[PDB]
Amino acid sequence: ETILEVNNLKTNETTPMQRLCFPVSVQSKTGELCAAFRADPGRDGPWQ
Amino acid sequence: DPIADMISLTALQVLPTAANTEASSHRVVPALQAA
Amino acid sequence: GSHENSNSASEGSTINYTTINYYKDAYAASAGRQDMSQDPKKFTDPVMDVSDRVAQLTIGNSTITTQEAANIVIAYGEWPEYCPDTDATAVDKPTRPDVSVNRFFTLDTKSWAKDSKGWYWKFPDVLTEVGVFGQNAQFHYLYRSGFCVHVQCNASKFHQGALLVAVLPEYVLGTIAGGTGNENSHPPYATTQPGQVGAVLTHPYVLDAGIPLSQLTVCPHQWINLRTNNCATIIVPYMNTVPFDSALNHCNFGLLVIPVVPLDFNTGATSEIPITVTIAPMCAEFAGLRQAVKQ
Amino acid sequence: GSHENSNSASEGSTINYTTINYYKDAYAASAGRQDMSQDPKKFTDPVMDVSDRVAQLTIGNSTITTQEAANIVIAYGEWPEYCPDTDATAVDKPTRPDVSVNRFFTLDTKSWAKDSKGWYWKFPDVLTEVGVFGQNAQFHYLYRSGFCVHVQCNASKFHQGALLVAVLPEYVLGTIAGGTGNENSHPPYATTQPGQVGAVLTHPYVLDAGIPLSQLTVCPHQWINLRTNNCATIIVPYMNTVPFDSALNHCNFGLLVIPVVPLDFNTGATSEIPITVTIAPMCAEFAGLRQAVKQ
Amino acid sequence: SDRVAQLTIGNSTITTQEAANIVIAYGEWPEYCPDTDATAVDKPTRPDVSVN
Numbered sequence: 005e006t007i008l009e010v011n012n013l014k015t016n017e018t019t020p021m022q023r024l025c026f027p028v029s030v031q032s033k034t035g036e037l038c039a040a041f042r043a044d045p046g047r048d049g050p051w052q
Numbered sequence: 053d054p055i056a057d058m059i060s061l062t063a064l065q066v067l068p069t070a071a072n073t074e075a076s077s078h079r080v081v082p083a084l085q086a087a
Numbered sequence: 088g089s090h091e092n093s094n095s096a097s098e099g100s101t102i103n104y105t106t107i108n109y110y111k112d113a114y115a116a117s118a119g120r121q122d123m124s125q126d127p128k129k130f131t132d133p134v135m136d137v138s139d140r141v142a143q144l145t146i147g148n149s150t151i152t153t154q155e156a157a158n159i160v161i162a163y164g165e166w167p168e169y170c171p172d173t174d175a176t177a178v179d180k181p182t183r184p185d186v187s188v189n190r191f192f193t194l195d196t197k198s199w200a201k202d203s204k205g206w207y208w209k210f211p212d213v214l215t216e217v218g219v220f221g222q223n224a225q226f227h228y229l230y231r232s233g234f235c236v237h238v239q240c241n242a243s244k245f246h247q248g249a250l251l252v253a254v255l256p257e258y259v260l261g262t263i264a265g266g267t268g269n270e271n272s273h274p275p276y277a278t279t280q281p282g283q284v285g286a287v288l289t290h291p292y293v294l295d296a297g298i299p300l301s302q303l304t305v306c307p308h309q310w311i312n313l314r315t316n317n318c319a320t321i322i323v324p325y326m327n328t329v330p331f332d333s334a335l336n337h338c339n340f341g342l343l344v345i346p347v348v349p350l351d352f353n354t355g356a357t358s359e360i361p362i363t364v365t366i367a368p369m370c371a372e373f374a375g376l377r378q379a380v381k382q
Numbered sequence: 383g384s385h386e387n388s389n390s391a392s393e394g395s396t397i398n399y400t401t402i403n404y405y406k407d408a409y410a411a412s413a414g415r416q417d418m419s420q421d422p423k424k425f426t427d428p429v430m431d432v433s434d435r436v437a438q439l440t441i442g443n444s445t446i447t448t449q450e451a452a453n454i455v456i457a458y459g460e461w462p463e464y465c466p467d468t469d470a471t472a473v474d475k476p477t478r479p480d481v482s483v484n485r486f487f488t489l490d491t492k493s494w495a496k497d498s499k500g501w502y503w504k505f506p507d508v509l510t511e512v513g514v515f516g517q518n519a520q521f522h523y524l525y526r527s528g529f530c531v532h533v534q535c536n537a538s539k540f541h542q543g544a545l546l547v548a549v550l551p552e553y554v555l556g557t558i559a560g561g562t563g564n565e566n567s568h569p570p571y572a573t574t575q576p577g578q579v580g581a582v583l584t585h586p587y588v589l590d591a592g593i594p595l596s597q598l599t600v601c602p603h604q605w606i607n608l609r610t611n612n613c614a615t616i617i618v619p620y621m622n623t624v625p626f627d628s629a630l631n632h633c634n635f636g637l638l639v640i641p642v643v644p645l646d647f648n649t650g651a652t653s654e655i656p657i658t659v660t661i662a663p664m665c666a667e668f669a670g671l672r673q674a675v676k677q
Numbered sequence: 678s679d680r681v682a683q684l685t686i687g688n689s690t691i692t693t694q695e696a697a698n699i700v701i702a703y704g705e706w707p708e709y710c711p712d713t714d715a716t717a718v719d720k721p722t723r724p725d726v727s728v729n
């Protein structure tokens with residue numbers, strides 16, 4: 005296991021350490037979506 | 053054969069009379085229940 | 088004479104009675120002496136194990152991991168099972184989809200508030216329009232199945248409250264009868280079969296049906312006491328006077344979630360305390376194929 | 383040296399070749415001598431019985447009774463079968479609905495006219511939106527199945543004509559290329575996957591694909607010659623380069639019904655001569671459950 | 678699981694769970710006085726449940 009950059013946003017690029025983890029926080033609405041990403045491992049994205 | 057994925061605990065008792073009571077003394081946690 | 092026909096209502100039980108009779112039909116006989124059988128371990132202790140919190144149940148392509156569990160209840164001490172040939176009546180070969188239907192479906196989430204009254208859902212009404220299960224329920228006249236009910240509710244060690252989660256077979260609802268009791272009103276389809284969103288109890292004390300909440304524990308149930316556990320699980324076997332039935336016209340039972348001890352917490356602590364219901368039908372069987380019918 | 387790795391494209395067949403080699407990889411080897419095997423009885427005689435007209439086949443809650451039958455064809459001499467573990471690749475447990483999907487579905491009827499060109503349907507496109515089969519095809523990513531095709535056409539002993547009913551695997555269609563052949567046009571989704579209504583051939587002689595109708599009989603087929611029989615039946619096993627596949631993006635084969643000898647009859651005789659298609663998937667298996675997708 | 682407990686004597690029962698185990702003073706259990714050590718000759722009364 006190695007770390008997945010799920011939080012690979014354009015706004016992180018200058019503070020990359022932030023890509024190494026994504027957040028969860030007290031929701032005000034039920035059943036919200038926290039994060040999403042492709043499972044394709046050889047594809048450009050979090051898996052890289 | 054060429055496919056491998058295709059190959060009540062409680063019961064009654066007769067109780068004619070009420071259960072009895074047995075002797076005990078000054079002596080495991082049976083008083084506290086997880087209701 | 089004395090030799091007769093086998094037509095008494097109690098001729099297929101492992102409990103015999105001594106009688107007296109002179110007519111050819113058995114039902115004419117006296118009530119007789121009552122044997123003294125008893126099974127107090129199917130209501131008072133229909134629990135799992137007749138590190139319990141720690142767990143993980145898998146069915147279909149779904150898996151639940153529960154750790155602040157209060158063990159698991161097996162309703163009336165019986166496991167769900169496909170209908171046996173002796174009890175069966177319909178002659179067509181039933182379809183038993185397995186994985187596509189016997190899995191975990193997670194319905195809408197409700198929010199628990201300091202003044203919440205309580206909620207309820209009907210089975211199988213809740214899934215008649217969900218996934219493959221629903222589709223089969225629509226295309227078939229007859230349906231039969233068991234259920235695994237998982238109710239979830241998290242909260243900090245600084246919150247408090249207690250939900251009573253119970254299953255009530257044949258949950259027939261009543262109306263407040265115009266208040267005065269002179270109006271013979273009836274619940275609309277939307278109240279008797281609320282769908283997957285469930286409904287709210289208006290008078291929890293009498294379960295909107297003229298019966299005491301105080302005695303609901305005589306039904307397969309489990310408690311979610313915030314300081315002890317944050318989820319409850321109940322396995323439910325098929326219950327009906329018939330082997331199969333319409334999933335549309337008849338709801339075998341209702342699930343009730345009622346705050347018996349109201350939610351409370353000091354202001355500043357998370358106020359959004361949701362309750363989520365995840366259910367999995369078990370041993371689903373369908374028969375009487377035809378075109379799809381929604382109701 | 384001489385001992386190597388087992389990586390030749392022809393290493394899993396009951397037909398061996400004698401070769402010469404000095405590299406560690408087997409595919410580097412020469413073609414070698416060709417053994418002389420042959421199976422001329424799967425194309426020239428893939429018929430039933432390797433009172434034949436008289437019959438009755440039952441599957442699911444459906445039954446066909448054929449009497450002016452021309453026997454039954456088993457495509458390429460193989461019966462449909464659930465996918466075996468050696469060939470399987472996807473690891474989730476597949477769902478095998480059985481009766482609710484393996485049964486007879488009867489699609490729209492077409493009318494045979496003295497000038498009809500011919501029709502075709504794609505599999506499984508034709509059932510993607512029908513009954514429980516369709517529903518499973520939508521909720522699952524992967525699908526695999528066989529088929530039983532029954533084409534029906536009645537006519538008096540005074541009518542004449544002959545339909546060629548054939549199955550063409552991977553029936554890829556082509557366009558007339560703007561006529562001149564300078565336009566690289568392509569068939570629209572409506573022509574490649576006509577649905578349950580099927581489509582009409584514009585140039586039957588070349589099967590709308592640059593190939594001779596005259597040779598279509600090299601495919602599992604059967605004839606409906608009005609003076610001899612009024613129905614045809616063909617069992618088709620799953621055919622693909624993969625064990626399972628999308629029922630939406632890929633059509634394993636097409637069914638063609640072409641009037642090779644045109645319909646004719648003396649005026650006064652019934653002019654409405656319909657053709658009806660009834661199909662039954664066999665050994666349907668689905669996997670990769672998720673939400674429903676129509677395309 | 679030493680913390681978890683429940684001791685019963687007479688018609689009373691204590692349930693202790695954040696216990697630090699139990700101490701037996703000088704390693705000896707209470708016991709009615711033995712005849713060798715006894716001196717007073719009258720038969721003693723041993724009420725049992727009403728007092729213990």
Ligand SMILES: [Cl-]
Pocket residue numbers: 034035194195196
């Ligand atoms: Cl929600």
Ligand SMILES: [Cl-]
Pocket residue numbers: 044045046047
């Ligand atoms: Cl990839």
Ligand SMILES: [Cl-]
Pocket residue numbers: 119120121
């Ligand atoms: Cl009696």
Ligand SMILES: [Cl-]
Pocket residue numbers: 196197198
């Ligand atoms: Cl709510």
Ligand SMILES: [Cl-]
Pocket residue numbers: 289290291292293
């Ligand atoms: Cl109330």
Ligand SMILES: [Cl-]
Pocket residue numbers: 414415416
């Ligand atoms: Cl050769």
Ligand SMILES: [Cl-]
Pocket residue numbers: 489490491
């Ligand atoms: Cl029609």
Ligand SMILES: [Cl-]
Pocket residue numbers: 491492493
């Ligand atoms: Cl037509």
Ligand SMILES: [Cl-]
Pocket residue numbers: 584585586587588
């Ligand atoms: Cl042509």
